[PDB]
Amino acid sequence: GAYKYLEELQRKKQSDVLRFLQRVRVWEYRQKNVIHRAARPTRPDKARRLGYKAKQGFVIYRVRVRRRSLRATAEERVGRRAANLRVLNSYWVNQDSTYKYFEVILVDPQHKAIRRDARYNWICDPVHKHREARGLTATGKKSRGINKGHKFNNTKAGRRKTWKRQNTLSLWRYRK
């Protein structure tokens, strides 16, 4: 398939053709709004490996942010704007000195293709409301820093959690 070509070509960003397309598209998107709807993913392979499918119930927004993180704030903007949609994920496409550009995949839990088709029906659950608001996305888990490793220690929110471990005292019926 052709996706391996797109990925390997995508890894060479400062190559002449990609910076050409980047330099055209940053001006072209600069013409448009801060937030708008893209007809199709400009980086389809990246959208696939983030989970995009080309059917009804998949909405692609393109979002502009000024230079929390920038990516998570970009997700929060389209989460606030299209509340009926659930945010699947997001990825970088383009940037300027003034703005970075992100391309965000959102999924509607109202469309019957999404309400059926059991690979994706889990996102219809109301526990998946506003994953970007709770940092439950990929960039949210990265900025929370949730993995396995000794490199991963008590960091910020978990720090208050282990402050909570220092703040509360546990007593049994029979004192130990």
Partner: protein, 187 residues
């Protein structure tokens, strides 16, 4: 309006700036009569529509429903091939006898390797003008690629001379200017 303003300001900012030579291979494309005969070729090899498919299915199914199991014989379907990953899939065997490549795709990067890929695989590619005209011959809105592998014996001699025609008209004419940086002249 805004969108008219942008779609007129588009293709100005492109030509004003230096395009890389892996682009502008597009619009160095096939001329009038050769694209015309290429379309006359591929309309001989239209794929079956969903209606024609379902119609033949109902015919043979009513045959088996009577039963009236007539015979078990059909040579093969021959048609154009149009799925992009399927088109790339027919290369790297190789199976593509001819490939048509649309010049206009908005994610151009879907397409840019295909001339070099058919160049190295030796596949007779040709850059066609307009993916809508590809979609018309393949019952889609757009197609952006058009591979053709299997040809009847009635058409095989026309195929080879079309290949030689394209390799004369495309590979000889535009090969050196393909290497050159296009555009760059202001508007």
């Amino acid at each position: 309006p805004e969108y008219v303003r942008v779609q007129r300001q588009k293709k100005i900012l492109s030509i004003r700036l230096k395009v890389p030579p892996t682009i502008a291979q597009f619009q160095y494309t096939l001329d009038r009569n050769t694209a015309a005969e290429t379309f006359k070729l591929f309309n001989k090899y239209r794929p079956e529509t969903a209606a024609e498919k379902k119609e033949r299915l109902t015919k043979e199914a009513a045959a088996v429903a009577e039963g009236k199991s007539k015979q078990d014989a059909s040579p093969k379907p021959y048609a154009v091939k149009y799925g992009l990953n399927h088109v790339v899939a027919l290369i790297e065997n190789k199976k593509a006898k001819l490939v048509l490549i649309a010049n206009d795709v908005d994610p151009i990067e879907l397409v840019v390797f295909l001339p070099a890929l058919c160049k190295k695989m030796g596949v007779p590619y040709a850059i066609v003008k307009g993916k809508a005209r590809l979609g018309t011959l393949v019952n889609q809105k757009t197609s952006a690629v058009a591979a053709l592998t299997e040809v009847r014996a009635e058409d095989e001699a026309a195929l080879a001379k079309l290949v030689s025609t394209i390799d004369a008209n495309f590979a000889d004419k535009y090969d050196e200017v393909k290497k050159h940086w296009g555009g760059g002249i202001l508007g």
